[PDB]
Scaffold this active site. Structure first.
Site, PDB file in Angstrom:
ATOM      1  N   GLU A   1       0.882  -1.160   0.000  1.00  0.00           N
ATOM      2  CA  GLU A   1       0.000   0.000   0.000  1.00  0.00           C
ATOM      3  C   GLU A   1       0.922   1.213   0.000  1.00  0.00           C
ATOM      4  OE1 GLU A   1      -2.285   0.291   3.678  1.00  0.00           O
ATOM      5  OE2 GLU A   1      -4.058   1.098   2.658  1.00  0.00           O
TER       6      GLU A   1
ATOM      7  N   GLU B   1      -8.137  11.320   2.818  1.00  0.00           N
ATOM      8  CA  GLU B   1      -8.236  10.373   3.921  1.00  0.00           C
ATOM      9  C   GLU B   1      -8.553  11.135   5.194  1.00  0.00           C
ATOM     10  OE1 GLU B   1      -5.919   6.925   3.732  1.00  0.00           O
ATOM     11  OE2 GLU B   1      -5.330   7.262   1.641  1.00  0.00           O
TER      12      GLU B   1
END
Length: 245
Positions: free
Chosen positions: A123, A225
């Site tokens: 990721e 985010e």
């Protein structure tokens, strides 16, 4: 569907992913708990564990993300259903109430590697704005300059945590600039510079162009985010391809 790369993704079976919705030829407001899809030629991912958080995305890559207070986490944004080591990403944000972080965000995944090697799944993040430092659990790699901006790399380990391949153990790669990237101005992420910086300390990216994982393509998006927000907020902007011929 109609944009050629969307046609290819459709023909390769992107719709079998549970979260995948459809291709939208016109602007679309995404409000459900978890969705991927395409608006025009733009892939998107969208995920909240609750609240009214929503992604408004059009076929020109303009987007706006809203999130609600009450601590509900959100991750979402537009981009591509695959990563490309030589892609140059352009973006701007005109507004940002204070997202936890705004970042290029994507995955690599190599099914031919042992799953007991955390490098089989990565990721990765190229941070651009933040009020929370998500690299705080990472080890420091190196410092370098890309597009005149100084960045430092980090790598973290996630042990039996959620992922595009289900709960598993995997690495996160980070690149964090020396300064917040300003609102109201176009910026550019030369992805190859960050790939090289990671490779310079032996942090290699696994395959970024496959549908082999359980739940998602190995996408690459410009993500807002938000983690444990105490107040509502909004962040809006646009993403596009700057890759030269």
């Amino acid at each position: 569907k109609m944009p050629p790369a969307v046609a290819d993704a459709k023909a390769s079976g992107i719709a079998r992913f549970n979260a995948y919705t459809q291709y939208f030829p016109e602007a679309t407001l995404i409000t459900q708990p978890h969705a991927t899809g395409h608006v025009g030629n733009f892939f998107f991912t969208h995920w909240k564990d609750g609240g009214s958080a929503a992604l408004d995305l059009d076929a020109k890559g303009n987007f706006s993300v809203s999130w609600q207070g009450g601590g509900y986490n959100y991750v979402g944004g537009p981009g591509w259903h695959f990563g490309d080591k030589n892609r140059v990403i352009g973006y701007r944000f005109n507004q940002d109430s204070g997202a936890s972080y705004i970042t290029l965000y994507g995955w690599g995944y190599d099914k031919s590697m042992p799953a007991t090697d955390p490098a089989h799944l990565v990721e990765y993040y190229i941070l651009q704005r933040w009020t929370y430092d998500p690299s705080q659990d990472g080890i420091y790699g190196k410092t370098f300059v890309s597009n005149g901006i100084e960045y430092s790399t980090y790598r973290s380990i996630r042990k039996v945590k959620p992922s595009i391949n289900g709960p598993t153990t995997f690495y996160q790669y980070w690149s964090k600039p020396s300064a917040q990237q300003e609102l109201g101005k176009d910026h550019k992420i030369i992805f190859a510079d960050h790939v090289k910086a990671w490779a310079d300390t032996g942090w290699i990216l696994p395959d970024m162009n496959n549908f082999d994982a359980s739940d998602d393509p190995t996408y690459q998006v410009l993500a807002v985010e938000v983690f444990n927000p105490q107040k509502n907020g909004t962040a809006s902007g646009q993403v596009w391809d700057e890759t030269p011929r």
